[PDB]
């Protein structure tokens, strides 16, 4: 399971906290909830 | 080149846009600019 999704720019009050924000819908496409790791590569 | 990151809920008005927000120290990581594609995979 995998989803490539567009980067946009992180909100101010996460940045440096190593997060990254996916909605529902990529979540389910990925197999993952909130608080799960997830690795990015680009595409 | 990749990133492990932890999974966050969405900003109301992203739900449904297929982007993911990534700060700049992740991007750096991964070597992408914001309006790249990524993929993502659970860890």
């Known amino acids: 399971k995998s ?3 567009r ?6 009050e996460d940045v440096g906290k190593r997060v990254v924000r996916v909605d ?3 979540r389910a496409k990925v ?3 909130v608080g799960d ?7």
């Open 3 to 5: 989803v490539v999704a």
């Open 7 to 12: 980067v946009a720019e992180a909100y101010p």
């Open 37 to 43: 790791y997830v690795e990015v590569k680009k595409v």
């Open 31 to 33: 197999g993952v909830s």
């Open 24 to 26: 529902k819908y990529e």
